[PDB]
């Protein structure tokens, strides 16, 4: 009774605002909508200071539980309150990100949904789609815990399939255009991570990447369609629709300490073909055929 939720979510780019519209379709179908549930939206804006103080406010304001979507949102929310009960809404690495001790008995306050980057498969349609690509140069924030763990799994992927991982780090967004254009000079091909900070710079990357022509290999549906090469990704919207219900599982007294987090890992290839014909690529067939989007 009375059902009211905060919700925080870091950053605006296109992916979160579909796992927000999967949230919202997921409480639906269980009844939540309407005058059945109050959700207190709010967005940081990337801005870590915004993520501390709005933290502060949604676990103090009388709501049953609040959902981080995104890593620092969740991990803003859970550094915010003990006991309140906190729901990831697409974390790449709850343990790495100190959320939950382990992925079947989370051990506090907080569960979710996780989405594992599936480097392995990244790392086939690399060597299957681009076989002249030699040297990887990885684009990724050090501000970001779900990159951190993607990057050293994917390097010891690549690097076992005979590739070379280069790893260029920002800080933040404001660094991508001269990195980009450090990067490309020194690598084959670009890769990016399923990385917020990224993804909210993402035309960046394709408007300094546009005089080099490099190949981006970026982990997102929303990265391929604006100038990206190909990827393999989880669907964001059935990221949505999960976490949604497990909110309301969570609302209905399922404790978060006990919930398994519900993990995401094996994906599907999207293709540009555009993109892939205008570098020159020839698309295989087999790839073509198992393709799960092509733009
Ligand atoms: N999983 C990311 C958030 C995220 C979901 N979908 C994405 C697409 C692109 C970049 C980031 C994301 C995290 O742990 O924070």
């Known amino acids: 009774s009375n059902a009211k939720i905060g919700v925080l979510q870091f950053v605006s780019h296109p ?19 309407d005058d059945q549930v109050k959700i207190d939206f709010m967005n940081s804006e990337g801005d870590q200071s915004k993520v501390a ?15 981080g979507i995104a890593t620092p949102a969740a991990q803003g929310l859970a550094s915010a309150t003990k006991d309140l009960p906190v ?14 001790k382990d992925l079947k008995k989370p051990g506090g306050n907080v569960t979710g949904v996780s989405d594992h980057n599936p480097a392995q498969q990244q790392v086939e349609l690399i060597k299957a789609l681009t076989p002249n690509v030699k040297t990887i140069g990885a684009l990724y924030s050090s501000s970001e815990d779900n990159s951190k763990t993607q990057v050293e799994e994917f ?24 990195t980009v254009t450090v990067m490309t000079s020194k690598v084959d091909a670009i890769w990016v991570p399923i990385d917020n900070t990224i993804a909210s710079g993402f035309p960046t990357v394709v408007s300094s ?50 919930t398994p987090v519900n993990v995401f890992s ?13 570098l020159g690529i020839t ?5 073509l055929k198992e393709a799960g989007q092509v733009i």
């Not at 103080?53 to 959902?67: E, I």
């Open 266 to 278: 094996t994906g599907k290839s999207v293709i540009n073909k555009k993109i892939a014909q205008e």
């Open 155 to 178: 390097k010891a992927y690549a690097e076992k399939a005979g590739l070379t991982v280069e790893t260029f780090a920002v800080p933040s967004t404001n660094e991508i255009a001269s």
């Open 209 to 258: 990447n546009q005089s080099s022509k490099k190949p981006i290999y970026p982990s997102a549906t929303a990265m391929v369609e604006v100038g990206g090469l190909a990827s393999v990704v989880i669907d964001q919207h059935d990221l949505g629709v999960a976490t949604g219900k497990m909110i309301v599982q969570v609302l209905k007294g399922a404790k978060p300490a006990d």
């Open 53 to 67: 103080t709005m933290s502060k406010q949604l676990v103090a304001n009388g709501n049953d539980l609040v959902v």
């Open 283 to 287: 698309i295989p067939e087999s790839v």
């Open 15 to 33: 992916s979160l605002d579909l796992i927000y519209k999967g949230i919202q379709d997921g409480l639906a179908e269980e009844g939540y909508k």
């Open 87 to 100: 729901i990831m809404a697409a974390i790449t690495d709850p343990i790495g990100a100190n959320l939950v």
